[PDB]
Scaffold this active site. Sequence first.
Site, PDB file in Angstrom:
ATOM      1  CD  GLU A 131       2.020  50.581  -0.258  1.00 22.32           C
ATOM      2  OE1 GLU A 131       1.211  49.647   0.133  1.00 22.32           O
ATOM      3  OE2 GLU A 131       2.424  50.696  -1.456  1.00 22.32           O
ATOM      4  CG  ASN A 172       8.055  54.574  -1.191  1.00 24.10           C
ATOM      5  OD1 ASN A 172       8.384  55.559  -1.866  1.00 24.10           O
ATOM      6  ND2 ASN A 172       7.532  53.471  -1.747  1.00 24.10           N
ATOM      7  CG  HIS A 208       1.716  53.888  -8.229  1.00 24.42           C
ATOM      8  ND1 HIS A 208       2.435  53.302  -9.274  1.00 24.42           N
ATOM      9  CD2 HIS A 208       2.289  53.472  -7.086  1.00 24.42           C
ATOM     10  CE1 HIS A 208       3.410  52.583  -8.768  1.00 24.42           C
ATOM     11  NE2 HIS A 208       3.356  52.694  -7.441  1.00 24.42           N
ATOM     12  CD  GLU A 238       6.584  52.295  -5.437  1.00 18.78           C
ATOM     13  OE1 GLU A 238       5.466  51.858  -5.825  1.00 18.78           O
ATOM     14  OE2 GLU A 238       7.108  51.988  -4.318  1.00 18.78           O
ATOM     15  CG  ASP A 240       2.796  53.441 -12.575  1.00 20.17           C
ATOM     16  OD1 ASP A 240       2.070  54.126 -11.795  1.00 20.17           O
ATOM     17  OD2 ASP A 240       2.945  52.202 -12.461  1.00 20.17           O
TER      18      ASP A 240
END
Length: 319
Positions: A131, A172, A208, A238, A240
């Site tokens: 990030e 990432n 996400h 990640e 979801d």
Amino acid sequence: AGLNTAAKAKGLKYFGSATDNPELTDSAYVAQLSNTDDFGQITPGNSMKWDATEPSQNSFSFANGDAVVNLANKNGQLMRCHTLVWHSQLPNWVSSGSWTNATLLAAMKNHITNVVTHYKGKCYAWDVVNEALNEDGTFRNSVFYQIIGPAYIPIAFATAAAADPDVKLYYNDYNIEYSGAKATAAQNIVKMIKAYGAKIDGVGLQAHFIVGSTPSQSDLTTVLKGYTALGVEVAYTELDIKMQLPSTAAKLAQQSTDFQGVAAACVSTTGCVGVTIWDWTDKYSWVPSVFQGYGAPLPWDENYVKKPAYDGLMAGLGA
Ligand SMILES: *[C@@H]1O[C@H](CO)[C@@H](O)[C@H](O)[C@H]1NC(C)=O
């Protein structure tokens, strides 16, 4: 048959799940996390971050990370190790420190070398830098950027590669899975590291997403190929898909379609090595206060019972 078996049949290295140490005392939870039909890979959700591993300066703390690795090793699951340099979950000694370029580089390199050497040979991949970008494609004004400038990023990659030459090294980030200034900037970070001469093997796309607002299979695939074209592998790291509450049948069905598209985009993309969901049961999903009003993000419900999204993932993996 399960997610991991289906994924591997399509040429992915794994389908996998994150976990966290508070969950591991739940033997029913652990039995499904350990089911390698569904999960061939584990990420520690928290225990390899800087706040966990170096909470005071030079004081390395690996017991909780080691417990996750030991579980994966017992199960024959791969590890993705997460994450070395990040502005969040950083101990105050780093974020609040009085630094110069030399002194922060020393502390940052010391963090990387110690953590990566400790885990040498145990990790398929490291998220080396996490990030680094703002939403508008500027660099985040983290302590690393403000003190060191952009070079902190390639230096972190070079340092990781020196400690463990074979682990795959990933940049990432989130909101880089659809086109925009941020995805463009993420491409430019890849090019910048490679131009510096440091090793970068992968882009991690956190994924996400939101039910009903998830990028299409077509959009996702296009964006993946924008990264692979730069000479990196890619993974959804990640995944979801939180829904606006309350849950309803229509939302559960949409969520299944959304998850299906993400799995299909990966399977469609040469160089997409795998998908990791951010835990696997809604009981342990990551829904912090900024997403109040959202929930039920995962393919199993809080009772460990499959939701339609499980079938959507299977369909997306061609099973
Ligand atoms: C910090 O040192 C690195 C390594 O020599 C260099 O690339 C970077 O420009 C330096 N930044 C500052 C702010 O002096």
